DNA sequence: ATCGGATGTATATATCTGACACGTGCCTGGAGACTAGGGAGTAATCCCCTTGGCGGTTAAAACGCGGGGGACAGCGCGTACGTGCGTTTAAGCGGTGCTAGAGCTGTCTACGACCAATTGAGCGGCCTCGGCACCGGGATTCTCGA
DNA sequence: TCGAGAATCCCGGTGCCGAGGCCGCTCAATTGGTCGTAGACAGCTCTAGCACCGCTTAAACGCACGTACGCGCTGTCCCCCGCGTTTTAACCGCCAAGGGGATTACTCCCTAGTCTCCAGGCACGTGTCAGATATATACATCCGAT
């Protein structure tokens, strides 16, 4: 529906804070920022010479954090493209996130340790607690205003902390229906209101109010505002993401290199998008303020855009 | 010595005295609740009222005052929970109901 | 009610002005004309800046840039030119209109361009590339004022055929068609400045503002003389709400804009007031006048 | 020889839900066997039951049960219902 | 000109008002005469009732006329008009009768 | 099919199966774009639909804007006017060899007036039908037809 | 095909405002501001007819209108603004066209069960004209200058007037004429009509056209 | 008085009317003997267990309550009987 | 808890026919289920055939015939001559 | 005086004092007859006999001597009367008899 | 513990191995949700009537004897549980 | 080269081999959570034996086979070795299940 | 796709009636009242099966992947089957007449019922050990390309 | 079609626990009176069955014949079989908690059993209309020409 010939190896994209520009990274390491309006490059900056894996714009949109497969992170000016601040850590960064209200902090989730939470001012870190003490692999992710830390472990336990002490303020355990867990694949939240998702290992996306959770407390039996799945084929979720409002969600199926869209209050599935048969579907975002969503597979990006 | 009998005390038809002594007669048990016939009977009321009712829906469904046996084939095998209940049953001058299936119909 | 008095005139179109547009910062005024020159002027004290030229025939309109570095001239050559103002280079001639460009504007994020041509056609174009994105069979009739809505979601246009439409931006589609009873030749329209209503010029002397939402004339203006040229039309906003115009009588026409009321007449024009210009943050008004005048003056009020 | 029926109580029934419509002896007979047949039915299955119970003693819950065992569905709800009227009206005696 | 209706019509007609009546299709007699020479065979001279032969008789033709129901049942699946021996033999198979 | 089922169906393929293009015929007109079998549904002439009471008074309308009226009877009720507010199908010139026809079909209470393929059309062929226009006192024709009547009426 | 909702002929709900409410009990028409018109299903092309209008519904701020009207009748308008229509006004009997009201005519009662006769031929058209009855009692000649084109009956509600049209088998004060025909007969007349309207266009599907001697 | 041959006293127009009832429209041949075994066999069970009944009834004639606990106990209850 | 079965039976009269040969555990207790199907069957016959016969006596005769009604052609031919058998031995002493 | 076991008198092998517990405790007549529990008890001797021995057949064919369930499966499906008597009777660890269509054989 | 979807828990591979022990060479997809339906279906009764035993039985788990009487009643009787 | 036997021929020894064994062919604890599934429909937080649920899923098996055998002769009836849910359909319809 | 003619079918009518609703006198099962035992109900105890979880494995399931194999659609023909009309034929009414055998009553008697006293056949429980299940390996035979 | 290869059959050897055998330890089987009674049996009816025979006729058998579905064959598509790989969770083994299942011991509410009396049910007459039947009629629908 609309691709872009003007960048190559396509690993990982991130819109900014009005949809307006594209940071994605590319194999060489480099990050390719790119204009939907003039439909453009609009800077590139030699980021590393490790692919980058996780980019992430600032509020102001003036810093991207970057992370390399050196386990090498990096604050980029988008303006001047320098290294703000660099850090390096063990077992590899599987993630990084800005703190929405507040640039200075950063979480990182590695691939082995726990997800620590670092400022830019002070070159500081807090690790947040791990319920199990064993997990090894526990995504994490702010809340839509940074207020709350949800930690989700490869064996289904939900920690809700409080983003400033730490301090346990919601838990649960997810159920693959019968009494097994499964591994939290990633966590998302809405940029408007409160409803977020998981993506498990179960492939099926449960769809939650994080009110809900807070009030449900610690150790309690939530339920999902939403079950998400292909009934039909079973396909597991490279990567999901709500839609800009927050009333459509879209599942990327690199099985068979589909886009799934269901609605929120029903969960209907909207529609079916279908990439090239022969492409491996890796990365997707949704504009979170157009009805357009990017794709980046076998690592060119396509664009999806909904006309009235 | 006031009489009154249980199908009354039940303010209904089926005779419990009846089917007490029927019961106690078939050899099932050696003793029996008392409320058992009134129970059952009444089971038998209400059953028999839906059969009969279809029938008679039938019945004047075809300006049939006093009901045939066509009546309740029709109706035995309209009802899906009757029907199920009575698959395996066979009625006299039943027949069949109407059922046509779809290629026989030429086209 | 306003007094707007005679400030500073300026003149130098060696041809009949067509229009003259206040910078959005205020700081300069440009002047298209059938000379196939473009004058930038100082906004305050009337300083002629300088001359762009570089179309091939007349010019039909021009408009400002909203960071106020670029203005777009639609000429009769059939096509549009994007200036640097600052430099006067012609950073792209916009070639696609089949017959004489009549109007042209940019969107409110100043990076795509509406314009109207005698084709009937409206085209939409890009800035950055210069290049065509869309064109639309638009009109029966010449189109005489295209203009974007607060955002650049929604485009009017208007033409000599009496049709206002309203298109969508994103797809083209003809949202809707304000008529009103009959088929006046509509020569200007634009969009309320909070995108709610839109003024529209017909050439039976009448100024018609609507509501967009309710899709009807809410109000009128009348007394001005228009019936054959497009005259422009401005929201007086930098002190009391009015609505100034030309007039083929060589007036100013300024009315009340709730009252509907004629509020000022300026006079001094020799021919018709062609252009009407109102400044973004002062009471000040460039008005334009045609080759029997070829003068441009500026108006200050107090209010 | 004196033999039983119940063209008495279906009749009585019959007028109970339709005094208008009539009945044919034939269908009467034909009521008769049946409800007959479905007595035994529940007869064997409640004593079968108690028999699983062991209880040499018939009560009205085993008649419940078996019921709802024999019955399609709302039948038996609705069946248990005017059944528990019943033994209530009887109890309340 | 003489006048022949298309073939299954007439059939489709019988039916139709096969379906519609409800009493016996067998000759009374024959059924009778196929029942005692039946019942000569497990013990001679042997005495019915009227009701218990007219019960055997519908009791019979109501198995044949399920038998003849799903074996064009069945025929649907066979996707044929008409019936074959191995239909009927088949259903009786599924009817557990082998 | 189900005439809502094939009505959806159309709806749906009516954006890439015909085109618009320069005609031999007269100015622009509806071209096929993929090989369109016959008695197929090709597009619907959507617009405005209104009673036949209101027709003249929109007409005199366009006759004093100077717009052509693009209305199509669809009964001695209503008539789909797609003046100001049409589709693709506006451009269907006519041919006195039609390989489409005009039908009139009811979609939940809703009539529709539907150009079906008279026969198998293939590729690139321009479509037109009969517009049964009545003899008036005259508008040559040029499509190009050998049975052509040499006027619409 | 044009299948019509309706077991009679009666007002057709095509041809009625967005401001115009119906009750089947009566099939009463009644409104809520200003005027509006509605008419009949059928429409009269030749031939003398007759109607009736029965009121139910007549407060001093309640004053109907009725008559015919051609198309061309904007159904918003009261049955009588335009030159193509001819109506009378349910406050004293006023024949009301082009706007215009004239006294060339009886005194109306709010529980009038009124009688509608008309005639037209098979520039006035030839003979035509126009009676009014009130309750079979001849109120008079309404209009016999009548313009060609169909007609129809109709009814223009002010604010809350309540009025129905009705046909012929269920008559009162019926004409005992053998020419002229109920609302019904022309109903079907017409739906004929145009069933054969339907069938003629279908053929125009198969090469050729054929009518008999023309004068029918 | 030996009695036989009463099966093919079933006439092939009485199987066809069975047939029709029955809701078919063509049939062949090679059914109706075949037809007639299967009745037959059918018949062949129950009426022995009828008068296996009356074997136990000790008496020489056949009554219906007989075949009625017969179909009962061959699972093909009827009504109307007794 | 005392539960009963035959399978020491069972055991008996395989020897009684095959002195050489074992069985499953699993095979013996499906045998004994089918003792026990049997058993019910033939029981609740001559239990309906006596209630025809309005009999509230279950005696030898009624157990021959309810088997000829049950059992088909040799089968029940064998049978019954082997109870008769039986039942002459018994009675002989 | 000593006690034998009825069955001996009998001389059968199932013990006909259950037997005749079961009968009383089954609620079938109000009193048994003497010999209704021997003759009984003897056809389930002998068809207990009947089955035994086809399952041993079936297990030495298969060179077997703890006698699985498979083989009196096939055994009961290679007897037609059992059959007729079992075929409505399901059976554990039965799986199904070898039977091959002839249609469905290559060419 | 609420459970759900164990349906489709029955494998594909499972049903064709089913298949293949009742002598089954080519099958269709479209079979094997169907199947599925059909066996929760079956089930679909016992299950409740064997509860229903356990319901007079007054107890809280099931036994096999349920499912034998049920299986009986539903003359599908299976042997070797007692 | 690759060697790929002819089709159904590896079915047919699976068909084979399978009437050869007698063990289940279904996976234990799927099975056994489908039972507790359709238990708490008609009431939740029931227990169960294992040889109760052994019962269970030999005895469904059991049908299930049957289903399949008598499925596939009416295939066999229907002249094709592909199986269709008409086939199926029907068998209920013989075996009285519909 | 229609119209015309043939034919078959739903309707009103009339009356005949014989099932059928209705009422009786007479019978006995049902109600009413009273006594006993003891099945059933409750409760505290034990056990112990179940339900729950945890970790490692792989056989099994998921999924993909050609691709020949047959489902299926179509197409010719022909034989077998509806049909309408012939023909002849037992089927049914019905009514007669005899009695063989159901079907009833009245004994009287053998026969379990039942209880009590007695106990050894049988059953839970405990060794035990050998066909049997598994495994690995070698030899055999089907099958798919010549 | 004669080999290659592959799945299988069979053989010897290993180790095991269920099949089985035996052992305490009854309660349920036997024995023997004793008693009221189920029915065995005799001995009557009467009636329903069984057969007889005649009369009418709707029904059945066969014919001829059109014809049209059954069947047989061809080519296509697609699709499910077979194999390869990758993932997983069933299984399996072990542990543990408790919650229900089963048990026993009391305790007594309810039912069986008895006796009394009569009133609802049942056989039995009795008018009587729902509907069966026949007829003419009006409507629906097929089949062939157009």
Known sequence: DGTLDCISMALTCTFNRWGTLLAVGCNDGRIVIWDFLTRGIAKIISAHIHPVCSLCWSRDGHKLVSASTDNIVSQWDVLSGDCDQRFRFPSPILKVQYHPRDQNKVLVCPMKSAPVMLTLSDSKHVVLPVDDDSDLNVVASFDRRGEYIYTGNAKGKILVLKTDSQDLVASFRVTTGTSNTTAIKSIEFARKGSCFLINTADRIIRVYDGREILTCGRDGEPEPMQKLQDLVNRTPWKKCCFSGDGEYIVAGSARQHALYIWEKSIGNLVKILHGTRGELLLDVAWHPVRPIIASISSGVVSIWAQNQ | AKAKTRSSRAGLQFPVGRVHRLLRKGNYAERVGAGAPVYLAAVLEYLTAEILELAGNAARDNKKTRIIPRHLQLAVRNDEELNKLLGRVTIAQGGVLPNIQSVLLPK | ?303 | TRKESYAIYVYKVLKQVHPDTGISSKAMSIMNSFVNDVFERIAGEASRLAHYNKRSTITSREIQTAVRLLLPGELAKHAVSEGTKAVTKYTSA | ?98 | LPMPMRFRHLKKTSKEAVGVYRSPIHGRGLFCKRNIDAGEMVIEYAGIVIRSILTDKREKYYDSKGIGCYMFRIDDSEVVDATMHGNAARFINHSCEPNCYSRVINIDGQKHIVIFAMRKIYRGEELTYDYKFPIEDKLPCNCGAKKCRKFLN | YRACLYERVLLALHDRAPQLKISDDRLTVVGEKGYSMVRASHGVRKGAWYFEITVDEMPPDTAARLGWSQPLGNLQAPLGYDKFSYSWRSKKGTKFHQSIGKHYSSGYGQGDVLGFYINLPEKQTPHSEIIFYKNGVNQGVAYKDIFEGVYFPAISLYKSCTVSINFGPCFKYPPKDLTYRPMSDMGWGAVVEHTLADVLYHVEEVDGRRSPPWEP | ?82
């Open chain 3, 1 to 303: 009610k306003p007094n707007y008095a005679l400030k500073f005139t300026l003149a130098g179109h060696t041809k009949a002005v067509s229009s003259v547009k206040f910078s959005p910062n205020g700081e300069w005024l440009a002047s298209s004309s059938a000379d196939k020159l473009i004058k930038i002027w100082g906004a305050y004290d009337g300083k002629f800046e300088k001359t762009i030229s570089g179309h091939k025939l007349g010019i039909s309109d021009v408009a400002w840039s909203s960071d106020s570095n670029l203005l777009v001239s639609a000429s009769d050559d059939k096509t549009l030119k994007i200036w640097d103002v600052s430099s006067g280079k012609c950073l792209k001639t916009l070639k696609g209109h089949s017959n004489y460009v009549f109007c042209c504007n940019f969107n409110p994020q100043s990076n795509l361009i509406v314009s109207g041509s005698f084709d009937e056609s409206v085209r939409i174009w890009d800035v950055k590339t210069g290049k065509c994105l869309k064109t639309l069979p638009a009109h029966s009739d010449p189109v005489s004022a295209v203009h974007f809505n607060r955002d650049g979601s929604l485009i009017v246009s208007s033409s000599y055929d009496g049709l206002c439409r309203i298109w969508d931006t994103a797809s083209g589609q003809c949202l809707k068609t304000l008529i009103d009873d009959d088929n006046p030749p509509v020569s200007f329209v634009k969009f309320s400045p909070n995108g709610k209503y839109i003024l529209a010029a017909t050439l039976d002397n009448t100024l018609k503002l609507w509501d967009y939402s309710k899709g009807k004339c809410l109000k009128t203006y009348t007394g001005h003389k228009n019936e054959k040229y497009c005259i422009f039309a401005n929201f007086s906003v930098t002190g009391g709400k009015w609505i100034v115009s030309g007039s083929e009588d060589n007036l100013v026409y300024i009315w009340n804009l709730q009252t509907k009321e004629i509020v000022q007449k300026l006079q001094g024009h020799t021919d018709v007031v062609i252009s009407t210009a109102c400044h973004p943050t002062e009471n000040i008004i460039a008005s334009a006048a045609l080759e029997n005048d070829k003068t441009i003056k500026l108006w200050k009020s107090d209010c």
């Open chain 5, 1 to 98: 000109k003489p006048h022949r209706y298309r073939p299954g019509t007439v059939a489709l007609r019988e039916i139709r008002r096969y379906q519609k009546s409800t009493e016996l299709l067998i000759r009374k007699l024959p059924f009778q005469r196929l029942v005692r020479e039946i019942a000569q065979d497990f013990k001679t001279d042997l005495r019915f009732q009227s009701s218990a032969v007219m019960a055997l008789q519908e009791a019979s033709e109501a198995y044949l006329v399920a038998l003849f129901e799903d074996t064009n049942l069945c025929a649907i699946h066979a996707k044929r008009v008409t019936i074959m021996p191995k239909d009927i033999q088949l259903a009786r198979r599924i009817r557990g009768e082998r």
């Open chain 8, 1 to 82: 008085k030996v009695l036989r041959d009463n099966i093919q006293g079933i006439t092939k127009p009485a199987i066809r009317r069975l047939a029709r009832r029955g809701g078919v429209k063509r049939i062949s041949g090679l059914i109706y003997e075949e037809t007639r075994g299967v009745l037959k066999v059918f018949l062949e069970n129950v009426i022995r267990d009828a008068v296996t009944y009356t074997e136990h009834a000790k008496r020489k004639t056949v009554t219906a309550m007989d075949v009625v606990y017969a179909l009962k106990r061959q699972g093909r209850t009827l009504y109307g009987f007794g």
